């Protein structure tokens, strides 16, 4: 018996816009890349902005019936109130292709990059800047007329953590007070989009949901993992419905809105231990050492985590999608295995009743992996950066067969799947 998925299930791949499109000259990343800040690698990416017609054909060729990608706001508004029709018609064009070829799109309105001019005004740190976000949404409601699935922000907490708490990404800030004010503004921004789009669209949000484990059995550490889990995951998502989001000193009041679906981005698990330092909110995080074999960034592979992530996320009573799941290796055999084992768990989730409607593999093709540059290869499709040649890997075909047939067959389960509980 093959592992069967529902007919309407989505088997797609995902990309952003700064990572694959080339020369995105108007966003904050491009800027810091160019001056050599951090941003310490630059891009012209996969030059998808030129080759999109081919990438879509290739995509249609492998048998994927869905594509998750994002619209670059800085392209539609290079500067203050200067709209751009070229960018508009081009994305509009990309959308048509997808539809005429039967690929269900899922569009992300914001995926880590913002227009430089917007950031110069302080970005989402300053609530007044939300008027700019509003203009963007109004214009994008026209651009997406054929699309059904929209997600406002891609991983808002990772966005907040990297650029405001950790100083790892633009604007390079290390401030708990500010990081929380930004999160509250992201929640307002989401509420603003939902209000403007929910009519004609299904408006969701995309959350990175790591599996957070205690570094030990001691209650001191168990309490610490729950706290960290609530702080990085549930308080932010709770706020969408409750309207309250607790900061360091304040509790921000935002209007209650909704999300028509929650996209779950799942990669690995983290271990948390208790600390005395309030600056670190009283806990230290490290990557969980679960699998003996590590990933290119040294992450563990923990297939069961995706089931747990979906389970925890179903608490909101909204349909779920795995909007991202992938692996960076130079060993594609490991990728086929990774994909299959995660799908076995995505399948058991469906079996246990969870409302999961799709799976998007993180990355149709290798691409710009932010601060880490081009070294990590998450792609089903290899990309030659000198030529821009797309060379599909074995995984691209295996996954292609799966998406096309809506099932994982015997041969594959036995070769790569997990034995126990079969499925």
Percent helix, strand, coil in the chain, to 5, is 45, 20, 40
CA dihedral 362, 366, 368, 372 (to 10 degrees): 80
How is residue 173 written in tokens?
A: 């800030």
327: left (phi over 0), alpha (psi -120 to 50) or beta: beta
Coil/strand/helix, residue 388: coil
Which CATH number is associated with domain 1-423? 3.20.20.80
Beta strands per DSSP E along 147-243 = 149-154, 202-208, 211-214
Burial class (CB in 10 A: 0-12, 13-18, 19+), 80: exposed
Bridge partners of 107? 69, 150
Length of the chain: 423
Q: Which of 21, 72, 324, 369 is catalytic?
A: 324
Separation between Cα atoms, residue 72 and residue 84, nearest integer Å: 12
- Rounded CA-CA distance 208/196 in Å is 24
Distance, in Å, from the CA atom of 423 to the CA atom of 421, rounded to the nearest integer, reads: 6
Does residue 177 have a cis peptide bond before it, meaning omega lies within 30 degrees of 0? no
Instruction: Please report, for the chain, the start and end positions of each structural domain, with discontinuous segments joined by +.
Output: 1-423
- Pinpoint the alpha helices (H) of 101-175: 116-120, 130-143, 156-160
Task: Quote the strand ranges of 163-227, DSSP E.
Answer: 202-208, 211-214
Give the count of beta carbons closer than 10 Å to the beta carbon of residue 336: 21
Experiment used for this model:
X-ray
Nominal resolution in Å?
2.5
418 vs 420: CA distance, rounded Å: 6
Instruction: Give dist(CA 203, CA 206) in Å, integer.
Output: 10
Catalytic annotation present for 79: no
Q: How far apart are alpha carbons 189 and 194 in whole angstroms?
A: 9
In a 13 Å sphere around the CA of 64, the CA atoms on its Cβ side amount to 32
* Chain centroid offset of residue 156 CA: 9
């Amino acid at each position: 018996m093959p592992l069967k998925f529902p007919e309407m299930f989505l088997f797609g791949t995902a990309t952003s816009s700064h990572q694959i499109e080339g020369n995105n000259r108007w966003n904050d990343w491009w800027y810091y890349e160019q001056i050599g800040k951090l941003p310490y690698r630059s891009g012209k990416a996969c030059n998808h902005w030129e080759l999109y017609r081919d990438d879509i054909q290739l995509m249609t060729s492998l048998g994927y019936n869905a594509y998750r990608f994002s619209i670059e706001w800085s392209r539609l508004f290079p500067e203050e109130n200067k709209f751009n029709e070229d960018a508009f018609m081009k994305y509009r064009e990309i959308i048509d292709l997808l539809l005429t070829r039967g690929i269900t799109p899922l569009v992300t309105l914001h995926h880590f990059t913002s227009p430089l001019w917007f950031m110069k005004k302080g970005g989402f740190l300053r609530e007044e800047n939300l008027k700019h976000w509003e203009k963007y949404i109004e214009k994008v409601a026209e651009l997406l007329e054929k699309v059904k699935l929209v997600a406002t922000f891609n991983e808002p907490m990772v966005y907040v953590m990297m650029g405001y708490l950790t100083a790892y990404w633009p604007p390079f800030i290390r401030s708990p007070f500010k990081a929380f004010k930004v999160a509250a503004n992201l929640l307002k921004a989401h509420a603003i989009a939902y209000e403007l789009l929910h009519g004609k669209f299904k408006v969701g949000i995309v959350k990175n949901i790591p599996i957070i484990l205690p570094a030990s059995d001691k209650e001191r550490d168990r309490k610490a993992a729950e706290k960290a889990d609530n702080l990085f995951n549930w308080h932010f998502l709770d706020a969408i419905w409750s309207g309250k989001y607790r900061g360091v000193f304040k509790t921000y009041r935002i209007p209650q809105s909704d999300a028509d679906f929650i996209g779950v981005n799942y990669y690995t698990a983290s271990e948390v231990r208790h600390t005395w330092n309030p600056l670190k909110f009283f806990f230290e995080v490290k990557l969980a050492d679960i699998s003996e074999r590590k990933t290119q960034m040294g992450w563990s592979v923990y297939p069961k985590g995706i089931y747990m992530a979906l389970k925890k996320a179903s608490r909101y009573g909204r349909p779920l999608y795995i909007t991202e799941n992938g692996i960076a290796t130079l060993d594609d055999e490991w990728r086929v295995e990774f994909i299959i084992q995660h799908l076995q768990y995505v399948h058991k989730a469906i079996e246990d009743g969870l409302d999961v409607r799709g799976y998007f593999y993180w990355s149709f093709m290798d691409n710009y992996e932010w601060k880490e540059g081009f070294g990590p290869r998450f792609g089903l499709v290899e990309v030659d950066y000198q030529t821009f040649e797309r060379r599909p890997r074995k995984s691209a075909y295996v996954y292609g067969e799966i998406a096309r047939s809506k099932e994982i067959k015997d041969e594959l389960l036995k070769r790569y799947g997990l034995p126990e509980l079969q499925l």
